[PDB]
Design an enzyme around this catalytic site. Structure first.
Site, PDB file in Angstrom:
ATOM      1  N   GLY A  22       0.816  -1.193   0.000  1.00  0.00           N
ATOM      2  CA  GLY A  22       0.000   0.000   0.000  1.00  0.00           C
ATOM      3  C   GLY A  22       0.855   1.249   0.000  1.00  0.00           C
ATOM      4  CE  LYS A  44       6.493   2.505   6.884  1.00  0.00           C
ATOM      5  NZ  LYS A  44       6.135   3.120   8.228  1.00  0.00           N
ATOM      6  CG  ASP A 139      -0.721  10.992  14.020  1.00  0.00           C
ATOM      7  OD1 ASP A 139      -1.913  11.313  14.295  1.00  0.00           O
ATOM      8  OD2 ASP A 139      -0.329  10.726  12.843  1.00  0.00           O
TER       9      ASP A 139
HETATM   10  N1  LIG Z   1      -2.611   3.192   4.256  1.00  0.00           N
HETATM   11  N2  LIG Z   1      -1.495   2.726   3.786  1.00  0.00           N
HETATM   12  N3  LIG Z   1      -0.397   2.290   3.257  1.00  0.00           N
HETATM   13  C1  LIG Z   1       0.608   1.498   3.978  1.00  0.00           C
HETATM   14  C2  LIG Z   1       0.027   0.111   4.132  1.00  0.00           C
HETATM   15  O1  LIG Z   1       1.370  -0.181   4.810  1.00  0.00           O
HETATM   16  C3  LIG Z   1       1.140  -1.202   5.775  1.00  0.00           C
HETATM   17  N4  LIG Z   1       2.319  -1.373   6.706  1.00  0.00           N
HETATM   18  C4  LIG Z   1       3.028  -0.413   7.351  1.00  0.00           C
HETATM   19  S1  LIG Z   1       2.739   1.354   7.285  1.00  0.00           S
HETATM   20  C5  LIG Z   1       2.235   1.683   9.009  1.00  0.00           C
HETATM   21  C6  LIG Z   1       1.765   3.103   9.375  1.00  0.00           C
HETATM   22  C7  LIG Z   1       2.728   4.293   9.123  1.00  0.00           C
HETATM   23  C8  LIG Z   1       3.046   4.602   7.630  1.00  0.00           C
HETATM   24  O2  LIG Z   1       2.078   4.947   6.909  1.00  0.00           O
HETATM   25  O3  LIG Z   1       4.239   4.587   7.237  1.00  0.00           O
HETATM   26  N5  LIG Z   1       3.996  -0.961   8.089  1.00  0.00           N
HETATM   27  C9  LIG Z   1       3.908  -2.293   7.919  1.00  0.00           C
HETATM   28  C10 LIG Z   1       4.616  -3.389   8.411  1.00  0.00           C
HETATM   29  N6  LIG Z   1       5.650  -3.249   9.246  1.00  0.00           N
HETATM   30  N7  LIG Z   1       4.245  -4.626   8.024  1.00  0.00           N
HETATM   31  C11 LIG Z   1       3.242  -4.824   7.184  1.00  0.00           C
HETATM   32  N8  LIG Z   1       2.553  -3.807   6.698  1.00  0.00           N
HETATM   33  C12 LIG Z   1       2.858  -2.542   7.046  1.00  0.00           C
HETATM   34  C13 LIG Z   1      -0.073  -0.563   6.446  1.00  0.00           C
HETATM   35  O4  LIG Z   1      -0.675  -1.588   7.266  1.00  0.00           O
HETATM   36  C14 LIG Z   1      -0.922  -0.509   5.197  1.00  0.00           C
HETATM   37  O5  LIG Z   1      -1.440  -1.773   4.797  1.00  0.00           O
END
Ligand SMILES: [N-]=[N+]=NC[C@H]1O[C@@H](n2c(SCCCC(=O)O)nc3c(N)ncnc32)[C@H](O)[C@@H]1O
Length: 342
Positions: A22, A44, A139
């Site tokens: 995502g 990321k 946040d």
């Molecule tokens: N909405 N959206 N897009 C991002 C998509 O990334 C997913 N995800 C994030 S991001 C967490 C919040 C902070 C940020 O936004 O960096 N870390 C994750 C992780 N370690 N493992 C698996 N999935 C992750 C999030 O669960 C969603 O499915």
């Protein structure tokens, strides 16, 4: 270099077999196979270097997550970037792969009382450590609570965090913008910069209410509407609580409103555990000085099956960027990430 959805995702050769997950707050998020640890991970992509504010948030996220080590806070396993500052355009943060987050979970799943209790315990256990480091998350919300397939919960995204500064918290009426709207404490709109630990407890209270019903408790439609929703449920503040607001504009706004009665929590949540609602009330207390603190919340009867202060650790070394140009911030990000080179 591998590409995902028409965009460079330059992480190899250690990390292969990428899949799009995502678009998060920082950029694209993918899963990938870690060929060293032989497990899939989350990666990321961050591209902050054109803007000072993006660099600030990225440095905060990296600096805080590298110094924290706690079971209920997401760790950084690895950071990928070019070998030189000149060649560094992107930064990739590698984390444990988490099945879901609480935002996605609440879209479709009803939580048992046992899951609510377990989730809340883990949030507060992580928050105890964060606050013990003199840090405010600022946040907290369902999408910043990650969950793996065995419901281990990890707090993420410290890009908006600050060092607590309660002596400089007071400000004027209708000027502050801290947290995501639905999770924003009433005093942010009245007289607070969000520099005290009570801002995070309010957000946890909002998350607890949302776990009880799968709907946000205070769904303000815009910045000014948020206080309407809070007061529509809490009712009018007491004289004592108003007397704690010295700012005349804020106080007179509240005095100008018609009387509103409190809506009892057990009418909003008729199937909720009564101990959960007692704790909810203490976290969603209007006056931030009367609001329960994280160590008191852990000790509340609702969490008695889990509470164990000797297994609720604190930070070894508390923390004791506004004017730096993006060039200095890039250099700081480069230095913060050097340990992962190789
Ligand atoms: N909405 N959206 N897009 C991002 C998509 O990334 C997913 N995800 C994030 S991001 C967490 C919040 C902070 C940020 O936004 O960096 N870390 C994750 C992780 N370690 N493992 C698996 N999935 C992750 C999030 O669960 C969603 O499915």
């Amino acid at each position: 270099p591998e590409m995902v959805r028409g965009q460079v995702f330059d992480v190899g050769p250690r990390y292969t077999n990428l899949s799009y997950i995502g678009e998060g707050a920082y950029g694209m998020v993918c899963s990938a196979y870690d060929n060293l640890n032989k497990v899939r991970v989350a990666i990321k992509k961050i591209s902050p270097f054109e803007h000072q504010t993006y660099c600030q948030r990225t440095l905060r996220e990296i600096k805080i997550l590298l110094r924290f080590r706690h079971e209920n806070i997401i760790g950084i396993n690895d950071i990928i970037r070019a070998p030189t500052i000149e060649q560094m355009k992107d930064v990739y943060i590698v984390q444990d792969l988490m099945e879901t987050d609480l935002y996605k979970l609440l879209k479709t799943q009803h939580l048992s009382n046992d899951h609510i209790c377990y989730f809340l315990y883990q949030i507060l256990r992580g928050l105890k450590y964060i606050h013990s480091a003199n840090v405010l998350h600022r946040d907290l919300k369902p999408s910043n609570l990650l969950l793996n397939t065995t419901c281990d919960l990890k707090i993420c995204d410290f890009g908006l965090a600050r060092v607590a500064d309660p002596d400089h918290d007071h400000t004027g009426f209708l000027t502050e913008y801290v947290a995501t709207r639905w999770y924003r404490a009433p005093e942010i709109m009245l007289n607070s910069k969000g520099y005290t630990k009570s801002i995070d407890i309010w957000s946890v209270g909002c998350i607890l209410a949302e776990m009880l019903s799968n709907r946000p408790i205070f769904p303000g439609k815009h910045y000014l509407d948020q206080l309407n929703h809070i007061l529509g449920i809490l009712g009018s503040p007491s004289q004592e609580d108003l007397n704690c607001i010295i700012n005349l504009k804020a106080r007179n706004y509240l005095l100008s409103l018609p009387h509103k009665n409190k809506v009892p929590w057990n009418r909003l949540f008729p199937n909720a555990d009564s101990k959960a609602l007692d704790l909810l009330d203490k976290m969603l207390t209007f006056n931030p000085h009367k609001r329960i603190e994280v160590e008191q919340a852990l000790a509340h009867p609702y969490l008695e099956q889990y509470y164990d202060p000797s297994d609720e650790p604190i930070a070894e070394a508390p923390f004791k960027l506004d004017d730096l140009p993006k060039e200095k911030l890039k250099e700081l990000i480069f230095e913060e990430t050097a340990r992962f080179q190789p």
